[PDB]
């Protein structure tokens, strides 16, 4: 069975989001709020397919992703340290846990000094 009919009873937004990730999309709390604000806590099939379209984010690219990290790179050198990126990722936005942030940073590189453009390029795939 498909990802929607496995858990349907309507499907909980939170589970729709997980399915979106398995399909290679990247929903944020903004998309969850949008889909909630017009269809409630649970979506019909048709509502859920709108949500997936909502989660395509075809404006996602390296130069859009790096904006916040650039703010912290004063001399626009191109790098930030793991711990810098961890603090950023765990304080602002839809904050990750320390563990989640470190796991992403460790998977991408074994060095402390991280090219955040290449890190943003890599997490897009």
């Amino acid at each position: 069975k498909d990802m929607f009919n496995t858990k349907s009873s309507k499907l909980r937004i939170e589970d729709a989001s997980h399915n979106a990730r398995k399909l290679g999309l990247a929903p944020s709390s903004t998309d969850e709020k949008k889909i909630r604000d017009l269809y409630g806590d649970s979506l019909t099939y048709e509502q859920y397919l709108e949500y997936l379209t909502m989660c395509v984010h075809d404006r996602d690219n390296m130069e859009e992703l790096i904006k916040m990290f650039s703010h912290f790179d004063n001399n626009s050198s191109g790098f930030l340290t793991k711990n810098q990126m961890k603090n950023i990722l765990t304080t602002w936005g839809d904050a990750l846990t320390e563990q989640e942030a470190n796991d992403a940073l460790n998977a991408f590189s074994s060095e402390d000094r991280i090219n955040y453009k290449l890190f943003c390029e890599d997490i897009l795939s």
Binding site: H18, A20, R21, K22, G24, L25, A26, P27, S28, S29, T30, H57, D60, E64, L65, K67, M68, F69, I88, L89, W92, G93, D94, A95, L96, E100, A101, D103, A104, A107, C120, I123, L124
Partner: peptide, 15 residues
């Protein structure tokens, strides 16, 4: 923007 990065990091968690 940072939220876009975080959304893709969570995407990356699931296999």
């Amino acid at each position: 923007s940072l939220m876009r990065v975080q959304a893709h990091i969570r995407k990356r968690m699931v296999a």
